[PDB]
Nucleic acid binder design. Structure first.
Ligand code: SFG
Ligand code: MG
Ligand code: MG
Ligand code: MG
Ligand code: MG
Ligand code: MG
Ligand code: MG
Ligand code: MG
Length: 257
RNA sequence: GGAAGUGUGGCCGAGCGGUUGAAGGCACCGGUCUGAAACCGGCGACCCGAAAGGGUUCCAGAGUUCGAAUCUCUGCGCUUCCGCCA
Protein backbone atom coordinates (compact mmCIF):
# COMPACT_ATOMS: atom_id res chain seq x y z
CA UNK A 1 0.00 0.00 0.00
CA UNK A 2 1.43 3.33 -1.20
CA UNK A 3 0.53 6.92 -0.37
CA UNK A 4 -1.90 8.71 -2.69
CA UNK A 5 -0.12 10.78 -5.31
CA UNK A 6 -2.59 13.51 -6.31
CA UNK A 7 -1.47 13.58 -10.01
CA UNK A 8 -4.67 12.21 -11.54
CA UNK A 9 -7.06 14.20 -9.29
CA UNK A 10 -5.15 17.48 -9.28
CA UNK A 11 -7.73 19.37 -11.34
CA UNK A 12 -10.76 17.83 -9.60
CA UNK A 13 -9.27 18.67 -6.18
CA UNK A 14 -8.45 22.25 -7.15
CA UNK A 15 -11.89 22.76 -8.69
CA UNK A 16 -14.18 21.03 -6.16
CA UNK A 17 -12.28 22.10 -3.01
CA UNK A 18 -10.45 25.35 -3.63
CA UNK A 19 -12.99 26.46 -6.21
CA UNK A 20 -15.85 26.33 -3.65
CA UNK A 21 -16.73 27.38 -0.11
CA UNK A 22 -15.25 24.05 1.02
CA UNK A 23 -11.74 25.38 0.38
CA UNK A 24 -12.56 28.92 1.40
CA UNK A 25 -13.84 27.82 4.83
CA UNK A 26 -10.93 25.39 5.25
CA UNK A 27 -8.46 28.23 4.70
CA UNK A 28 -10.38 30.73 6.84
CA UNK A 29 -10.51 28.56 9.96
CA UNK A 30 -6.98 27.22 9.46
CA UNK A 31 -5.55 30.73 9.23
CA UNK A 32 -7.35 31.82 12.40
CA UNK A 33 -5.22 29.19 14.15
CA UNK A 34 -2.05 29.74 12.15
CA UNK A 35 -1.94 33.50 12.72
CA UNK A 36 -2.29 32.81 16.44
CA UNK A 37 0.63 30.37 16.16
CA UNK A 38 2.81 32.79 14.17
CA UNK A 39 2.28 35.56 16.71
CA UNK A 40 2.81 33.32 19.73
CA UNK A 41 6.08 32.11 18.16
CA UNK A 42 7.66 35.56 18.41
CA UNK A 43 8.03 38.16 15.65
CA UNK A 44 11.09 36.67 13.93
CA UNK A 45 10.62 35.11 10.51
CA UNK A 46 10.43 31.33 10.41
CA UNK A 47 11.52 28.26 8.48
CA UNK A 48 8.34 26.42 7.48
CA UNK A 49 8.15 22.94 5.96
CA UNK A 50 4.88 22.37 4.07
CA UNK A 51 5.06 18.58 3.76
CA UNK A 52 2.61 17.46 1.09
CA UNK A 53 1.83 21.10 0.29
CA UNK A 54 -0.04 20.27 -2.91
CA UNK A 55 -0.93 23.28 -5.03
CA UNK A 56 0.61 25.53 -2.38
CA UNK A 57 -2.24 27.87 -1.40
CA UNK A 58 -1.28 27.66 2.28
CA UNK A 59 2.46 27.67 1.57
CA UNK A 60 2.26 30.81 -0.58
CA UNK A 61 0.23 32.63 2.11
CA UNK A 62 2.98 31.71 4.57
CA UNK A 63 5.52 33.11 2.08
CA UNK A 64 3.55 36.35 1.64
CA UNK A 65 4.01 36.85 5.39
CA UNK A 66 7.80 36.81 4.90
CA UNK A 67 8.93 33.36 6.03
CA UNK A 68 11.18 30.86 4.27
CA UNK A 69 8.84 28.10 3.07
CA UNK A 70 9.90 24.67 1.81
CA UNK A 71 7.17 22.75 -0.01
CA UNK A 72 7.57 19.05 -0.77
CA UNK A 73 5.03 16.80 -2.48
CA UNK A 74 4.77 13.35 -4.07
CA UNK A 75 2.97 14.75 -7.10
CA UNK A 76 4.95 16.31 -9.94
CA UNK A 77 1.69 17.85 -11.17
CA UNK A 78 0.99 19.51 -7.80
CA UNK A 79 4.57 20.81 -7.60
CA UNK A 80 4.29 22.44 -11.02
CA UNK A 81 0.96 24.06 -10.07
CA UNK A 82 2.49 25.36 -6.83
CA UNK A 83 5.50 26.76 -8.73
CA UNK A 84 3.24 28.69 -11.14
CA UNK A 85 0.96 30.10 -8.44
CA UNK A 86 3.97 31.24 -6.41
CA UNK A 87 5.55 33.09 -9.35
CA UNK A 88 2.19 34.77 -10.04
CA UNK A 89 2.26 36.01 -6.43
CA UNK A 90 5.88 37.18 -6.42
CA UNK A 91 7.02 34.94 -3.55
CA UNK A 92 9.21 32.40 -5.41
CA UNK A 93 12.40 33.76 -3.81
CA UNK A 94 11.13 32.78 -0.34
CA UNK A 95 10.13 29.33 -1.53
CA UNK A 96 11.68 25.95 -2.22
CA UNK A 97 9.90 23.13 -4.07
CA UNK A 98 10.95 19.51 -3.58
CA UNK A 99 9.54 16.51 -5.45
CA UNK A 100 9.88 13.91 -2.68
CA UNK A 101 7.81 12.01 -0.17
CA UNK A 102 7.50 13.64 3.23
CA UNK A 103 9.19 10.44 4.50
CA UNK A 104 12.33 11.31 2.48
CA UNK A 105 12.46 15.05 3.15
CA UNK A 106 15.19 15.08 5.82
CA UNK A 107 17.99 14.70 3.27
CA UNK A 108 16.79 17.87 1.47
CA UNK A 109 16.93 20.20 4.50
CA UNK A 110 20.22 21.81 5.48
CA UNK A 111 18.87 22.84 8.90
CA UNK A 112 15.79 22.03 11.01
CA UNK A 113 12.54 23.92 10.56
CA UNK A 114 10.47 25.97 12.99
CA UNK A 115 6.98 25.02 11.81
CA UNK A 116 5.61 22.06 9.87
CA UNK A 117 2.37 22.12 7.91
CA UNK A 118 0.90 18.65 7.35
CA UNK A 119 -2.54 19.53 5.95
CA UNK A 120 -4.95 16.97 4.48
CA UNK A 121 -2.14 14.41 4.03
CA UNK A 122 -2.48 12.04 7.02
CA UNK A 123 -5.69 10.43 5.66
CA UNK A 124 -3.86 9.66 2.39
CA UNK A 125 -0.65 8.00 3.72
CA UNK A 126 -0.55 4.28 4.41
CA UNK A 127 1.75 4.52 7.48
CA UNK A 128 0.77 7.66 9.42
CA UNK A 129 2.77 6.76 12.56
CA UNK A 130 5.97 6.59 10.53
CA UNK A 131 5.53 9.91 8.67
CA UNK A 132 4.87 11.72 11.94
CA UNK A 133 8.10 10.28 13.34
CA UNK A 134 10.08 11.64 10.40
CA UNK A 135 8.43 15.07 10.68
CA UNK A 136 9.38 15.13 14.36
CA UNK A 137 13.00 14.48 13.45
CA UNK A 138 13.30 17.62 11.26
CA UNK A 139 11.62 19.96 13.76
CA UNK A 140 13.75 22.01 16.14
CA UNK A 141 12.98 21.83 19.89
CA UNK A 142 10.10 24.16 20.62
CA UNK A 143 8.86 23.89 17.02
CA UNK A 144 5.20 23.45 16.14
CA UNK A 145 3.36 20.91 14.00
CA UNK A 146 0.20 22.19 12.27
CA UNK A 147 -1.70 18.96 11.59
CA UNK A 148 -4.99 18.92 9.68
CA UNK A 149 -6.42 15.46 9.15
CA UNK A 150 -9.67 14.21 7.66
CA UNK A 151 -12.11 13.10 10.36
CA UNK A 152 -13.94 9.78 10.02
CA UNK A 153 -16.82 11.13 12.10
CA UNK A 154 -17.50 13.85 9.54
CA UNK A 155 -17.88 11.23 6.81
CA UNK A 156 -20.21 9.10 8.91
CA UNK A 157 -22.24 12.14 9.94
CA UNK A 158 -22.55 13.61 6.45
CA UNK A 159 -23.42 10.30 4.85
CA UNK A 160 -26.15 9.99 7.49
CA UNK A 161 -27.42 13.56 6.96
CA UNK A 162 -27.50 12.91 3.18
CA UNK A 163 -29.50 9.71 3.71
CA UNK A 164 -26.99 7.20 2.24
CA UNK A 165 -28.06 4.64 4.81
CA UNK A 166 -27.10 1.56 2.76
CA UNK A 167 -23.52 2.79 2.39
CA UNK A 168 -23.22 3.46 6.14
CA UNK A 169 -24.81 0.09 6.96
CA UNK A 170 -22.06 -1.48 4.82
CA UNK A 171 -19.29 0.36 6.70
CA UNK A 172 -18.66 3.01 3.99
CA UNK A 173 -16.00 1.04 2.06
CA UNK A 174 -13.90 3.16 -0.29
CA UNK A 175 -14.43 1.55 -3.71
CA UNK A 176 -14.66 4.66 -5.89
CA UNK A 177 -11.41 5.55 -7.59
CA UNK A 178 -10.64 9.24 -8.06
CA UNK A 179 -13.15 10.49 -5.51
CA UNK A 180 -12.05 13.20 -3.13
CA UNK A 181 -13.17 11.08 -0.16
CA UNK A 182 -9.83 9.93 1.29
CA UNK A 183 -8.32 6.46 1.43
CA UNK A 184 -7.96 6.41 5.25
CA UNK A 185 -10.36 8.64 7.18
CA UNK A 186 -8.92 8.94 10.67
CA UNK A 187 -10.35 8.45 14.13
CA UNK A 188 -9.46 11.67 16.01
CA UNK A 189 -8.88 9.89 19.34
CA UNK A 190 -6.39 7.58 17.64
CA UNK A 191 -4.61 10.54 16.02
CA UNK A 192 -4.36 12.27 19.40
CA UNK A 193 -2.76 9.12 20.84
CA UNK A 194 -0.26 8.99 17.97
CA UNK A 195 0.89 12.51 18.83
CA UNK A 196 1.04 12.08 22.60
CA UNK A 197 2.78 8.71 22.50
CA UNK A 198 5.39 10.14 20.11
CA UNK A 199 6.14 12.93 22.61
CA UNK A 200 4.21 15.83 21.07
CA UNK A 201 2.18 18.03 23.40
CA UNK A 202 -1.18 19.15 22.06
CA UNK A 203 -1.88 22.88 22.30
CA UNK A 204 -5.14 23.18 20.31
CA UNK A 205 -7.94 21.30 18.54
CA UNK A 206 -10.15 23.01 15.96
CA UNK A 207 -13.01 21.62 13.92
CA UNK A 208 -12.78 22.66 10.26
CA UNK A 209 -16.25 22.84 8.63
CA UNK A 210 -18.40 21.65 11.56
CA UNK A 211 -21.75 22.85 10.14
CA UNK A 212 -21.10 23.74 6.48
CA UNK A 213 -21.26 20.25 4.95
CA UNK A 214 -24.43 19.23 6.84
CA UNK A 215 -26.69 22.12 5.74
CA UNK A 216 -30.21 21.06 4.74
CA UNK A 217 -30.07 23.75 2.02
CA UNK A 218 -26.67 23.54 0.36
CA UNK A 219 -27.13 26.86 -1.45
CA UNK A 220 -26.75 28.61 1.92
CA UNK A 221 -23.11 27.46 1.91
CA UNK A 222 -22.45 30.25 -0.60
CA UNK A 223 -25.46 32.57 -0.21
CA UNK A 224 -24.99 32.86 3.57
CA UNK A 225 -21.22 32.39 3.79
CA UNK A 226 -20.30 35.33 6.01
CA UNK A 227 -22.89 34.48 8.66
CA UNK A 228 -21.96 30.81 8.40
CA UNK A 229 -18.27 31.60 8.90
CA UNK A 230 -19.05 33.66 11.99
CA UNK A 231 -20.88 30.73 13.56
CA UNK A 232 -18.29 28.20 12.43
CA UNK A 233 -15.68 30.43 14.10
CA UNK A 234 -17.75 30.66 17.29
CA UNK A 235 -18.34 26.95 17.98
CA UNK A 236 -15.57 25.08 16.14
CA UNK A 237 -13.21 24.92 19.16
CA UNK A 238 -15.49 23.17 21.64
CA UNK A 239 -16.97 19.70 21.81
CA UNK A 240 -18.92 18.13 20.23
CA UNK A 241 -18.34 20.53 17.31
CA UNK A 242 -14.60 19.82 17.12
CA UNK A 243 -15.37 16.16 16.56
CA UNK A 244 -17.91 17.00 13.85
CA UNK A 245 -15.48 18.89 11.61
CA UNK A 246 -14.83 17.37 8.20
CA UNK A 247 -11.20 18.16 9.06
CA UNK A 248 -9.63 18.71 12.48
CA UNK A 249 -6.64 20.99 12.96
CA UNK A 250 -4.37 19.95 15.83
CA UNK A 251 -1.64 22.31 16.98
CA UNK A 252 1.21 20.45 18.67
CA UNK A 253 4.52 21.49 20.23
CA UNK A 254 7.86 19.76 20.15
CA UNK A 255 9.06 20.15 23.76
CA UNK A 256 12.27 21.81 24.87
CA UNK A 257 14.33 20.60 27.81
C1' G B 1 -32.65 -49.25 -27.47
C1' G B 2 -36.21 -46.80 -30.99
C1' A B 3 -38.96 -42.37 -33.02
C1' A B 4 -39.87 -37.60 -33.35
C1' G B 5 -38.22 -32.82 -30.95
C1' U B 6 -34.11 -30.23 -28.81
C1' G B 7 -29.04 -27.74 -27.89
C1' U B 8 -26.95 -19.44 -29.11
C1' G B 9 -22.26 -16.12 -25.31
C1' G B 10 -21.25 -16.30 -17.41
C1' C B 11 -26.79 -16.10 -17.01
C1' C B 12 -31.08 -14.56 -20.15
C1' G B 13 -32.60 -13.63 -25.12
C1' A B 14 -32.98 -12.02 -30.87
C1' G B 15 -31.08 -14.59 -35.13
C1' C B 16 -36.54 -19.11 -41.31
C1' G B 17 -28.10 -18.64 -46.34
C1' G B 18 -24.42 -13.14 -46.46
C1' U B 19 -23.23 -6.12 -42.99
C1' U B 20 -24.21 -11.94 -37.03
C1' G B 21 -18.50 -14.62 -32.96
C1' A B 22 -23.73 -12.70 -32.80
C1' A B 23 -29.10 -7.24 -31.28
C1' G B 24 -30.94 -6.19 -26.53
C1' G B 25 -30.79 -7.19 -20.92
C1' C B 26 -28.41 -8.61 -16.18
C1' A B 27 -23.74 -9.87 -14.12
C1' C B 28 -18.49 -8.97 -14.24
C1' C B 29 -14.07 -5.25 -15.67
C1' G B 30 -12.54 -0.33 -16.80
C1' G B 31 -13.88 5.13 -17.57
C1' U B 32 -16.97 9.79 -16.29
C1' C B 33 -19.68 11.88 -11.89
C1' U B 34 -21.04 15.67 -4.90
C1' G B 35 -22.37 11.60 -1.51
C1' A B 36 -23.96 6.40 -1.85
C1' A B 37 -28.64 5.53 -10.23
C1' A B 38 -27.14 7.25 -15.03
C1' C B 39 -23.88 7.53 -19.23
C1' C B 40 -19.34 5.55 -22.21
C1' G B 41 -16.15 1.34 -23.57
C1' G B 42 -15.12 -3.72 -22.91
C1' C B 43 -16.49 -8.59 -21.69
C1' G B 44 -15.70 -17.20 -23.67
C1' A B 45 -12.45 -21.13 -25.10
C1' C B 46 -8.87 -23.25 -28.15
C1' C B 47 -5.01 -23.00 -32.12
C1' C B 48 -1.17 -19.85 -34.76
C1' G B 49 2.26 -15.71 -34.35
C1' A B 50 8.27 -12.25 -32.09
C1' A B 51 4.58 -8.72 -32.39
C1' A B 52 0.72 -6.41 -34.95
C1' G B 53 -2.74 -9.48 -35.68
C1' G B 54 -4.84 -14.14 -38.08
C1' G B 55 -7.83 -18.96 -37.66
C1' U B 56 -11.52 -22.34 -35.52
C1' U B 57 -15.66 -22.87 -32.67
C1' C B 58 -23.43 -20.85 -31.77
C1' C B 59 -23.44 -29.17 -28.45
C1' A B 60 -18.90 -31.74 -31.62
C1' G B 61 -17.45 -32.90 -36.43
C1' A B 62 -18.20 -33.91 -41.68
C1' G B 63 -20.63 -32.16 -45.98
C1' U B 64 -23.80 -28.84 -49.57
C1' U B 65 -22.83 -23.70 -51.02
C1' C B 66 -19.17 -18.28 -53.82
C1' G B 67 -20.79 -17.82 -48.49
C1' A B 68 -23.37 -21.68 -42.89
C1' A B 69 -24.96 -19.89 -35.90
C1' U B 70 -28.94 -20.48 -40.15
C1' C B 71 -29.42 -26.18 -44.99
C1' U B 72 -28.11 -31.89 -44.97
C1' C B 73 -25.78 -35.90 -42.52
C1' U B 74 -23.08 -38.58 -38.42
C1' G B 75 -22.09 -38.45 -33.39
C1' C B 76 -22.69 -36.40 -28.25
C1' G B 77 -26.08 -34.41 -24.22
C1' C B 78 -30.95 -33.70 -22.92
C1' U B 79 -36.64 -33.93 -23.30
C1' U B 80 -41.11 -36.35 -24.28
C1' C B 81 -43.26 -40.73 -26.18
C1' C B 82 -42.44 -45.75 -26.82
C1' G B 83 -39.88 -50.05 -26.03
C1' C B 84 -36.69 -52.15 -22.18
C1' C B 85 -37.22 -53.65 -16.53
C1' A B 86 -41.48 -55.38 -13.02
N1 SFG C 1 3.83 10.78 1.62
C1 SFG C 1 3.60 11.95 1.02
N2 SFG C 1 4.59 12.87 1.00
C2 SFG C 1 4.36 14.05 0.40
N3 SFG C 1 3.25 14.48 -0.19
C3 SFG C 1 2.29 13.56 -0.14
C4 SFG C 1 2.37 12.30 0.42
N4 SFG C 1 1.17 11.63 0.28
C5 SFG C 1 0.40 12.46 -0.37
N5 SFG C 1 1.03 13.65 -0.68
C6 SFG C 1 0.46 14.82 -1.32
O1 SFG C 1 -0.37 15.38 -0.34
C7 SFG C 1 -1.31 16.27 -0.98
C8 SFG C 1 -2.63 16.17 -0.21
C9 SFG C 1 -3.78 17.06 -0.68
N6 SFG C 1 -4.92 16.87 0.26
C10 SFG C 1 -3.38 18.53 -0.68
C11 SFG C 1 -2.71 18.96 0.60
C12 SFG C 1 -2.36 20.45 0.69
N7 SFG C 1 -1.42 20.67 1.82
C13 SFG C 1 -3.63 21.28 0.93
O2 SFG C 1 -3.92 21.54 2.12
O3 SFG C 1 -4.30 21.61 -0.08
C14 SFG C 1 -1.36 15.84 -2.44
O4 SFG C 1 -0.80 16.91 -3.19
C15 SFG C 1 -0.49 14.58 -2.49
O5 SFG C 1 0.21 14.44 -3.71
MG1 MG D 1 -29.21 -20.10 -22.80
MG1 MG E 1 -16.49 -12.42 -28.66
MG1 MG F 1 -24.16 -8.35 -25.09
MG1 MG G 1 -22.80 -1.37 -21.69
MG1 MG H 1 -21.35 -26.53 -34.95
MG1 MG I 1 -21.07 -16.35 -40.48
MG1 MG J 1 -18.45 -25.12 -42.33
Amino acid sequence: AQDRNFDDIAEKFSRNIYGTTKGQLRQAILWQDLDRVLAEMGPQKLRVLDAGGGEGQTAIKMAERGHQVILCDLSAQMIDRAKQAAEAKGVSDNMQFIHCAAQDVASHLETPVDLILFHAVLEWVADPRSVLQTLWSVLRPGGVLSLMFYNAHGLLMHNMVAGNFDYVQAGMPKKKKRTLSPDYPRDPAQVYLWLEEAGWQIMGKTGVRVFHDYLREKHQQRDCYEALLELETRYCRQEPYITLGRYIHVTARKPQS
